[PDB]
């Protein structure tokens, strides 16, 4: 049976995948791509993002390090790894300790 | 709304949490918590270390950089990382372009 910590991982390659073989190569992101990915999956981890275009024209450029105007597997989870290490965070930030009582915000 | 690249992100975290509370530190995973998590979470995944001890061994000590004996959450995720892109290289390996059909084996 596949665990919840199996089903996130194929999820996320499973999203990737549902945004990079819309068009060019099957497996890279275009910038149209991308965009619609952030805008559709990442709307509430990136509200900032999805409304301003201008954040993710500096997102693709830092993401896209061999400079070919496409996001790979690999270029692309450096943004998941980031995200993930930022939710840990705040997740941290949310739960106070002490307060003798739980809190139920997760990570924004 | 959580999309699912959202949830993904947050399950990882909150199961990696649901194996670091049960003892020492709350925010680390002991030798205990550790064998306890890949043995419940990535039976499949990692259908060898399940049953054989001796790979849990290995990995621990290859995630624990810092050797404290415990794995921290950025140490942990470097293992997280490389089943992403095991799963995701395994992926396009079960599924074969040419064939003119579709394969559902996913990753293994
Ligand atoms: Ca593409
Ligand atoms: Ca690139
Ligand atoms: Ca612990
Ligand atoms: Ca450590
Ligand atoms: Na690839
Ligand atoms: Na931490
Ligand atoms: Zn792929
Ligand atoms: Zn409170
Ligand atoms: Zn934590
Ligand atoms: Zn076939």
New interface residues.
């Given amino acids: ?13 499973d ?1 990737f995948h549902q945004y990079s073989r819309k068009e060019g190569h099957p ?1 890279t992101l275009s910038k149209k791509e991308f965009r619609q ?1 952030v805008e ?6 990136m509200k900032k993002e999805k409304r301003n275009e201008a954040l993710i024209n500096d997102i693709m450029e830092d993401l896209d390090t061999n400079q070919d105007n496409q996001l790979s ?2 270029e692309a ?1 450096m943004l ?2 980031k ?3 930022a ?2 965070e705040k ?2 930030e949310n739960n106070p300790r002490g307060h003798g009582h739980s809190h139920g915000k ?2 924004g």
């Fill in positions: 049976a596949p665990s919840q910590m199996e089903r996130s991982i194929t999820t996320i390659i999203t497996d990915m559709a999956q990442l709307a509430t981890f597997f690999e989870m998941m790894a995200l993930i290490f939710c840990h997740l941290h997760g990570c």
